[PDB]
């Protein structure tokens, strides 16, 4: 459940999925994981299309937005109606091309989690903190969404 675009090579990005990964499991749930810098590929697609529930997405690095194009379009078929976008600020340095799709997610109105704004480029501690902690409360919506509220007695 929740599906964490990273990537394994780049920066610190697959240190922060687990952080957002292991927070939840910790607790009790599950976190999907996808490279969006690698391992890029229908494997990770046929996934999205199942656990297409909740998705998190991290910076947009011009080097990874042109392995992103094709997968992109892909993508806009599966996901629908108003699932989770976990988008985590954590490198002040992305692409032009991202805002036209920001426009979507913005047009189309999907559960954006915390936006902050230009963490230098270098992912620190504090974005750990960050990654975790906005992940797992993300995760708090879609659960108590998709348990269908008093589908279970308490």
Known sequence: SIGVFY????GYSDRLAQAIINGITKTGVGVDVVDLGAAVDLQEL???????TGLVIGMSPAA???????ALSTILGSVNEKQAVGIFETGGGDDEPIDPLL??????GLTTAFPAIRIKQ???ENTYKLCEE???????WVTRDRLEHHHHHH
């Open 103 to 108: 426009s979507k997610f913005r047009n189309l």
């Open 7 to 10: 990537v394994s090579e780049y």
């Open 64 to 70: 990874s937005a042109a392995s992103i194009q094709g």
């Open 122 to 124: 270098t992912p620190t």
């Open 134 to 140: 906005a992940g797992t409360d993300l995760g708090q």
């Open 46 to 52: 046929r996934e999205l299309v199942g656990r297409c």
